[PDB]
């Protein structure tokens, strides 16, 4: 039975995941994070920092098309960051996950942190998560393409006007929700805030759209953003992994 015990150990380390051939794990007993500090990547590094889970971060170099490599694609077939491998997954077996949304939900369940205990407020929290994932992320990103990236050279500005109006409309929904609340779920800081902070920060910072979306006419979203940014875990998460 020496062979059989080696077999059971093999299913608990990470050599069965082909991504590790390109980004080797130094700490096979820690969550492997494959990411960049983009608005989507930082959701997960922030969550990991807020939970105190040990992890090992790996920058994925998009300049070299490393997200298009067979090794990266074996974990996320969509070719995007973030992705993780949790060696201590359900049933003490390693689990790979892509999609920031699935990962945030996974880490909140794993740790019993950043999701209300109350069943109704838990469901409510997931609506706001889904709101960021289907609305905020994709729409702010389209604004970015037409304002900051290659879409900015297109002469017809109606696309740009469309994503500016939708980004402002989304911010207005946040603004009514944060009127009289500390966090999206009131006194509880949750994966809904962790999903959303980076995108708002990015919109008014890197994207250079602060005036474009009339951000400084808002009251409640700016104060909420300031609250999130004062959290040490947010400050840490925002710069992990270092850019390659």
């Amino acid at each position: 039975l020496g062979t059989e015990n080696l077999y059971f150990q093999s299913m608990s380390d990470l050599s069965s995941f082909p991504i590790t051939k390109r980004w080797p794990a130094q700490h096979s007993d820690r969550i492997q994070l494959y990411s960049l500090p983009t608005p989507n990547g930082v959701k997960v590094s922030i969550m990991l920092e807020e939970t105190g889970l040990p992890y090992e971060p790996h920058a994925i170099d998009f300049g070299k098309d490393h997200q298009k490599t067979p090794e990266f694609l074996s974990l996320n077939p969509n070719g995007k960051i973030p992705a993780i491998i949790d060696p201590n997954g359900p049933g003490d077996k390693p689990l790979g996950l892509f999609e920031s949304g699935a990962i945030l939900q996974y880490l909140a369940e794993k740790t019993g942190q950043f999701l209300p205990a109350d069943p109704a407020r838990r469901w409510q929290t997931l609506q706001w998560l889904h709101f960021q994932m289907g609305g905020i992320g994709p729409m702010f990103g389209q604004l970015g393409f037409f304002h900051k990236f290659a879409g900015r050279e297109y002469e017809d500005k109606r696309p740009l006007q469309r994503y500016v109006a939708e980004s402002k409309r989304l911010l207005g929904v946040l603004e009514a929700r944060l009127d009289g609340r500390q966090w999206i779920m009131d006194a509880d800081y949750t994966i809904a805030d962790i999903a959303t902070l980076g995108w708002v920060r990015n919109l008014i910072g890197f994207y250079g759209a602060r005036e474009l979306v009339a951000f400084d006419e808002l009251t409640h979203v700016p104060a909420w953003l300031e609250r999130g940014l004062a959290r040490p875990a947010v400050q840490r998460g925002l710069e992990i992994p270092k850019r390659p």
Copy 2:
């Protein structure tokens, strides 16, 4: 005791002991109607007339302040109290929990199913919808087609991810039909039907996504849910 929910002032419940669905048979609305049909849960659907801006009334906004469909109220929510929910994704997860169905048994496979859910919610829906805007709706009038070309390319790329995933699988999660399939089928149907983009995205060059769609559309609950509620 739904009286506390102001939406019922504009869309009264004839059956306050049943889930109230506020929706339209759009690619996002059909996710929830299909789920409800697949589960067999009693519910009472209400068409929300966008032609009359009804989704921007105080009554609708009290349930979804984002002013979109679908939305539900379950009178027999957690703690035998009513729960309002918006977002098709959150509703699918809630209904899967309510019924113990359309998620895999295995916890690892459950989290994997939620990946494909989120890939749909963050990728398929928003991108296919932008293609809709520039090919089917008002954006079709813009002479310069670079925006359209962008969303055609992204939608094809998304279909390419599904095509590789479905290669040798019956459903997205292998032998398990789940909320991942329920979330995605309507968007793919709509893309090649109502949006008129079947040739634009080179759909008939694919093998696995077309086969998967046919298997989904052969299900009676999908056929029922695709047309509920009836358009106002």
